Amino acid sequence: VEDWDLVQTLGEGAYGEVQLAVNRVTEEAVAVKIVDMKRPENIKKEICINKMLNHENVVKFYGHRREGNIQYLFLEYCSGGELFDRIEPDIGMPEPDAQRFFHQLMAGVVYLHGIGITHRDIKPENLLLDERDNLKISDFGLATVFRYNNRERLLNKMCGTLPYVAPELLKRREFHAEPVDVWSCGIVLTAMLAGELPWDQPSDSCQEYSDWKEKKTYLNPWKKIDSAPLALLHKILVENPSARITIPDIKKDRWYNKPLKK
Ligand SMILES: CCCn1nc(C2=C(N)NON2)nc1C1=C(N)NON1
């Protein structure tokens, strides 16, 4: 119903819904996120961050119109759905698939970090798959600038999703953006490799979290994992963000570089 027709709802959420839209003439498909500014400050921030983005592992932004209160963000259609739907509960997925998705995730994250954007809500629901199963980072609704004119700014707002959030964001008034995305990348890796999340939140008041810091890897996310990716997970899920491995160093890790897939 906007030069394009809207054909199936594709997802419905808080702000609004995402529809699949076609040209009835050219036949080109795209997704359109539909936010009712009544149901404005922050959709403005989202489209603004979107206009900066151009990368093969980031959902393409095509444009925006206003049409009443109704913003329509026109976005790359990802016909493979969500990474979340390739993770079999209690099982995960074959290790070579997990590794390729992890490579593509790191490529997307290094890119955002390079232009000073942090996504702040990396999780499998926000990692979409295209026609050839290429992973694309999706939904910049919580995204923000953490570097500008080459100067870093610390974050203070708590956001994201509790099982994915780094412990510093619950403990510190201000914290660096990049290690928080790294950590959330490690929780996604765990989910791909075990088919379960290790804890509700990285709090000292969380038993499963305490067990991990005590290195009880004979318990039940970790026991399904396998020594090579587990060793990478030991470097990512480090409580102190200044000792946590960085992306250039993840690129040097042994499992990250292990040949697995045809
Ligand atoms: C299950 C919802 C699917 N979804 N969600 C989004 C999206 C949201 N929810 N916020 O920004 N972008 N975008 C999509 C989507 C795209 N971008 N292509 O197919 N589906």
Q: Measured from the CB, is residue 80 less than 6 Å from ligand 1?
A: no
Listing DSSP states for 141-186 in one string gives TT-EE-EETTEE--B-S--S-GGGS-THHHH-SSB-HHHHHHHHHH
For ligand 1, the distance from its centroid to the CA atom of residue 11, given in whole angstroms, is 7
Please indicate if the annotation marks 11 as binding a ligand. Answer: yes
Dist. CA 189–CA 256, nearest whole Å: 11
The residues carrying an active-site annotation are: 121
Please indicate if the annotation marks 21 as binding a ligand. Answer: no
Q: Measured from the CB, is residue 33 less than 6 Å from ligand 1?
A: yes
Strands (E), 47-98: 61-65, 70-75, 81-82
Give the method of determination: X-ray
Q: Measured from the CB, is residue 63 less than 6 Å from ligand 1?
A: no
Dist. CA 113–CA 93, nearest whole Å: 28
Q: Measured from the CB, is residue 128 less than 6 Å from ligand 1?
A: yes
Dist. CA 230–CA 37, nearest whole Å: 44
Dist. CA 121–CA 162, nearest whole Å: 10
Please indicate if the annotation marks 165 as binding a ligand. Answer: no
Q: How many other C-beta atoms lie within 10 A of the C-beta of residue 68? A: 8
For ligand 1, the distance from its centroid to the CA atom of residue 173, given in whole angstroms, is 32
Domains of the chain: 1-88 (3.30.200.20), 89-262 (1.10.510.10)
Q: Three-state SS across 109-149? A: HHHHHHCCEECCCCCHHHEEECCCCCEEECCCCCCEECEEC
